[PDB]
Scaffold this active site. Structure first.
Site, short mmCIF file in Angstrom:
data_model
loop_
_atom_site.label_atom_id
_atom_site.label_comp_id
_atom_site.label_asym_id
_atom_site.label_seq_id
_atom_site.Cartn_x
_atom_site.Cartn_y
_atom_site.Cartn_z
N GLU D 23 -28.38 -19.59 -13.17
CA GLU D 23 -26.87 -19.86 -13.26
C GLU D 23 -26.44 -20.91 -12.43
O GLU D 23 -24.91 -20.84 -12.40
CB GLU D 23 -26.46 -18.45 -12.82
CG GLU D 23 -26.65 -17.96 -11.30
CD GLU D 23 -28.05 -17.36 -11.04
OE1 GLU D 23 -28.97 -17.78 -11.49
OE2 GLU D 23 -27.69 -16.20 -10.44
N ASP D 96 -30.01 -14.38 -9.25
CA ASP D 96 -29.97 -14.18 -7.83
C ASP D 96 -30.12 -12.56 -7.61
O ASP D 96 -29.47 -11.78 -8.62
CB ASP D 96 -29.05 -14.71 -7.03
CG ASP D 96 -28.72 -15.99 -7.36
OD1 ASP D 96 -29.51 -16.67 -8.19
OD2 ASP D 96 -27.66 -16.50 -6.98
N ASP D 98 -28.33 -10.77 -5.59
CA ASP D 98 -27.06 -10.39 -5.04
C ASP D 98 -26.14 -9.69 -6.27
O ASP D 98 -26.53 -9.60 -7.38
CB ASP D 98 -26.19 -11.46 -4.30
CG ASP D 98 -26.00 -12.51 -5.18
OD1 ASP D 98 -26.69 -12.67 -6.44
OD2 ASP D 98 -25.33 -13.52 -4.87
#
Ligand SMILES: COc1ccc2nccc(-n3cc(CCNCc4ccc5c(c4)NC(=O)CS5)nn3)c2n1
Lengths: 187, 487, 487, 186
Positions: D23, D96, D98
């Site tokens: 991303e 990721d 998160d």
DNA sequence: CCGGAAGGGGTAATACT
DNA sequence: AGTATTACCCCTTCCGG
């Protein structure tokens, strides 16, 4: 046909108009917030502008910021220059106080001299005396430079044209040695 | 209104910008070998404790400190300077220990400020060794709120060990990196032969150093360029990559380029050879591939045609492509604030002079501190030998000031050591503590005598410089990468 | 390799993201009235020392501390939140004192992070009052290196005084700002009538606050929307800008809009009017101008053709332009980590309990500190009456530990007080300093008694809360801006 | 005919090729530096990809990032989808750890499900277990980019209809349905 | 069009080979 | 044109109402 980022004035005639040229949107916002919008226009730039003296005419007529400047001014370049079209009878270059602001002022003055010589010889170009202009808020910025009654501006003038273009060439041309010698003796 | 002449304002503004860019933007410092941006970033990281003992800190934080206190410029410039200082392929001895995506030799850009974390390296600790001991001058920053060093102590020769290439107004500099051990040998010769003339020291240091040593390794062919650079400052070191031929099962041979010359942009070399194959200037090459990886290093495979020889393809690569190029070394540096072209002997002499000055200033500061400590300890011990009377006077005194006056009268004491006597702790009254106080006074007097002897003799401080630099080299020494060969 | 169901992974990931965005991205906390980004920026400015006592600091530095230490997100988001907190037209009581270009109500953007420097405000200091006294809970940061507060002390009702509208997943909240004096009156009634039921509390607090108070001033027509918002949380407050009619020397008339409703974008309302005139929806307006300036404030002058009535054009502007708008109030907030809708009495009660527990925790911490100081001072006094015995014992002691053991034997002292008398300065030996020691021991005992009294009686705690709130409101009070009028 | 940001591999047959979708360009550079360039391709993105379930088809296909994904995948969308192309027989969505990474992963999964249903059905979609710009080449290769040691989550379908209902309630325009869903499943 | 979040490209001066 | 310091900036997404 006017530049997109130009913030024009409400005045109709050019005799009582002003174009403040700034080198960023951060400084442009401060300038336009604390201006006399009826008379004063704010034209932001992108910082370093192309070198007219160190590039071909096609490229300097392709670059966006110089196009914005000439469209906001509205006049022609070189032979097709017409004073009667001038949108603002006062073009004030208002740059930051650091050395990079001086470099940008030199670049803009070189562009104007090589493209709008009349503008300069008719005494229609001014320089303003304000680490940058984005740190100044509306009140004091208006008080020092944007207030017409109290502001002090340096009006660009021509004494001898020949020495003018000679200095412009040896300072902005491609002859490095020339400017090496110049800066070594005159620093 | 007041007019200004076009030529006068033009020259002025341009000369101011040019002088600023020359002195404090791109040209390195002969004493420290660092541009002002690098100096400010290093000092901020040091003052902020981002040091090898501590863990890494986000690069955004350090960039923000450099911007707020020291460097009044854009964040992108500060960050890219930090990333360059943290780049093994751009620095022979990196000054910053980075973590994250700090770039690639090719076209990949470094990760954002919020993804990379940087601390200092032991080399950076020798860079900033004993800076707080008044070794170097300090000046107020742009807003005058904080103080920053004009130069780093620079206990190792950064300008020649890592080099500095920078573009300025009217002039450009390009100093190639060297090996630390050769620099150590040259500076040792300069220290012992401190009375040598320019020619003798130039010959000696040219004998001591073989030539530029690049982090990219590779090869150097010839010696005329290196000799001209070391004798005049303006030379052309012709560098070349490393190629080797590998045989395949079917009989095809491929050139395996494992090293490229300095500052050669990877993944641009490959596109250049592909374009030259396409349009046609490098006939003999069939296929090009990059097997370069993280685990095997740079490895370009050029599979050539059957009607071709390795030597002819190699020579064509050398003449037409960037597999062989030149380092246009120009030894321009800032000395006393002005730009000068310096040969190798001048660089060694300037570094040695800086080291001597730093050692002298450090010794003076340490001597002053020892003098103050000894004076306080002397007053305290003079109070101690009359401990009972001092305690009686402090008891009977109404307030502190009357006690100060009484002690001053009693023991011919000056107000400073009386003030120290008042702050004197109770636990210091144990016999071991008093004995430690006597022995500490004796040791401080011995150190004062030693420091005075050092200040008196310049051979002593030259010996200290030699010993510290030898210690630095032995602990941070490495073998030479680029091999100098003949034409 | 492990097979993963598409729906299970999608649901889990989206539930996690949604819960994170609701709890800790956009929904304000009921006790603090701040979103986590605002709380982190405030605490970063406080811990780093950017307080009104000293000068301002670069916003880039503060964003860097927030990002490196507390908020692991992009610098643009943190800077935007900081600028919004420093915006008068966006916050009824701004929490950050900024310098530079923080934007305009129109389309102008704020200056870059390297141009604006910001510190805290006195109201922000009331927000962070006595945070270090264990008033509020603390948690490790994202990487578990430093401690950050879960909630600010919030000594004044920030949530209702400034409001917090934010978009989350599944829900969106909108709370309008109020007046500090009216909120003070409501909380005073809540404190005095602490035993009141829900209905009487709601009626009283509805009586205390006339309605929302917006930093842009203006008008609120009607009361059904405000009342329904206060009793249910979901309402619609119709704001209307200020319009005046003026004459011209030629007989012309022009409507001057000097005030606009909340969250209405300037320089987009004007272009909307221009485009509606161009297409034709508001026939009657002949010209539009923006006489607005830094010295006259907002001023939109629209001049009207001769054959029109000012009232009909005013009603046309109200009906078709942004001159009249509605606040879709949704009193949604986070209570103990859960998103809930709340009527006004619930907000007042939650703030009241927050203040009460903050006061209790502060007084407990102060009592513990005073008890430790009293223990040290009692040890020092009880060693002080045996002064000659103590001095003689410390003298004969070979080592400090022997002196410590001897003092333990002689005075029946614990370890910490023995250390305290060991480190006692010689200045304390003077008679005046011993008298001051006894005096401060007596005062600290009196403070212990008073703090235990405060712990004993909840009415005392309510009294302290009332006095602190009254002092804050007197310090930082202001007149109401928006005028509530009938239909 | 391929996206400019794509860092393709050197293999030719799709059977031994795989595309790592990241991303960001910082994560893209970190992954490309530590990848096996002979077999692995890196396709960076610009953050949050458009929501396919909350936009019209013309606006969706106008967006640059989804166009890059489609062209790098090489295949068509909807009825004209033909598994013959599949430049890479392994599409590893790599985001990721998160919450924003999970949101981007969900957006990409719904985009693939709406536009490339046989891609997800054929088990050609994988999930990785890593901000990513804080990782250099070494640990990136050691943890998840080394084929011999890495472990991956392969997306699979058990009941298509329930998947459609779940996707509609989560990414559709029915706000109160997802309100009830998140309140129940919190 | 609003408030936090994701992500990032692109011109220009400056010498010298 | 590319090398390293600088000036400077815009523009798509998600998420409710
Ligand atoms: C891509 O096209 C365009 C077009 C116009 C643009 N105009 C402005 C900026 C643009 N972009 C900037 C960045 C990188 C983000 N910066 C990361 C960062 C992290 C911490 C800090 C910090 C900055 N800054 C401090 O001062 C201290 S903290 N990517 N794009 C941009 N991009």
């Amino acid at each position: 046909g006017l530049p997109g980022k130009l913030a024009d004035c409400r005045s109709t005639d050019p005799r009582k108009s002003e174009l403040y040229v700034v080198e960023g949107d951060s400084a442009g916002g401060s300038a336009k917030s604390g201006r006399d919008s009826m008379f004063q226009a704010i034209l932001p730039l992108r910082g370093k502008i192309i070198n007219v003296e160190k590039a071909r005419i096609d490229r300097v007529l392709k670059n966006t910021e110089v196009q914005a400047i000439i469209t906001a001014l509205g006049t022609g370049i070189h032979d097709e220059f017409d004073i009667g079209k001038l949108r603002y009878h006062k073009i004030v270059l208002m740059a930051d106080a650091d050395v990079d602001g001086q470099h940008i002022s030199t670049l803009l003055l070189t562009l104007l001299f090589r493209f709008m010589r009349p503008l300069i010889e008719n005494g229609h170009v001014f320089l303003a005396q304000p680490k940058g202009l984005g740190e100044m808020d509306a009140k004091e910025l208006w008080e020092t430079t944007m207030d017409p009654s109290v502001r002090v501006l340096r009006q660009v003038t021509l004494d001898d044209a020949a020495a003018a273009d000679e200095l412009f060439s040896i300072l902005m041309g491609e002859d490095v040695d020339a400017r090496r010698s110049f800066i070594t003796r005159n620093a | 209104i007041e007019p200004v002449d076009i030529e006068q304002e033009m020259q002025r503004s341009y000369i101011d910008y040019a002088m600023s860019v020359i002195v404090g933007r791109a040209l390195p410092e002969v004493r420290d070998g660092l541009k002002p941006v690098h100096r400010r970033v290093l000092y901020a990281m040091f003052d902020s404790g981002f040091r090898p003992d501590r863990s890494h800190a986000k690069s955004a934080r350090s960039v923000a400190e450099t911007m707020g206190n020291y460097h009044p410029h854009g964040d992108a410039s500060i960050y890219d300077s930090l990333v360059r200082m943290a780049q093994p392929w751009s620095l022979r001895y990196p000054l910053v220990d980075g973590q994250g995506n700090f770039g690639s030799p090719g076209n990949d850009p470094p990760a954002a400020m919020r993804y990379t974390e940087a601390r200092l390296t032991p080399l950076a600790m020798e860079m900033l060794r004993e800076i707080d001991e008044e070794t170097v001058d300090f000046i107020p920053n742009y807003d005058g709120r904080v103080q920053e060093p004009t130069v780093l102590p620079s206990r190792f020769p950064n300008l020649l060990a890592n080099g500095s290439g920078g573009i300025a107004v009217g002039m450009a500099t390009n100093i190639p990196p060297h090996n630390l051990r050769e620099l150590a040998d040259a500076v040792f010769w300069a220290l012992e032969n401190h009375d040598a003339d320019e020619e003798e020291t130039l010959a000696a240091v040219m004998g001591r150093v073989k030539g530029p040593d690049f982090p990219t390794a590779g090869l150097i062919v010839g010696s005329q360029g290196t000799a001209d650079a070391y004798k005049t400052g303006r030379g052309s070191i012709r560098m070349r990559g490393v190629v080797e031929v590998e045989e395949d099962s079917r009989g095809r041979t491929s050139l395996v380029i494992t090293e490229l010359p300095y500052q050669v942009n990877h993944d641009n070399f490959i596109t250049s050879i592909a374009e030259q194959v396409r349009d046609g200037k490098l006939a003999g090459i069939s296929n090009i591939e990059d097997q370069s990886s993280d685990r095997v290093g740079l490895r370009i495979v050029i599979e050539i045609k059957r009607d071709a020889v390795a030597k002819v393809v190699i020579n064509n690569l050398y003449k037409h492509t960037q597999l062989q190029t030149s380092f246009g070394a120009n030894m321009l540096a800032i000395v006393d604030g002005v730009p000068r072209t310096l040969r190798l002997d001048q660089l060694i002499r300037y570094y040695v002079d800086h080291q001597l000055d730093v050692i002298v200033r450090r010794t003076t500061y340490r001597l002053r501190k020892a003098n103050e400590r000894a004076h306080i300890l002397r007053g305290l011990v003079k109070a101690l030998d009359a401990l009972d009377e001092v305690i009686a006077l402090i008891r009977a005194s109404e307030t502190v000031d009357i006690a100060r006056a009484g002690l001053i009268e009693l023991l011919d004491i000056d107000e400073i050591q009386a003030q120290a006597i008042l702050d004197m702790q109770l636990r210091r009254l144990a016999a071991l503590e008093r004995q430690r106080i006597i022995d500490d006074l004796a040791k401080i007097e011995a150190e004062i005598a030693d420091l005075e002897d050092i200040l008196a003799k310049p051979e002593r401080q030259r010996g200290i410089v030699r010993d510290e630099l030898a210690e630095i080299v032995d602990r941070h020494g490495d073998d030479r990468r680029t091999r100098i060969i003949a034409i």
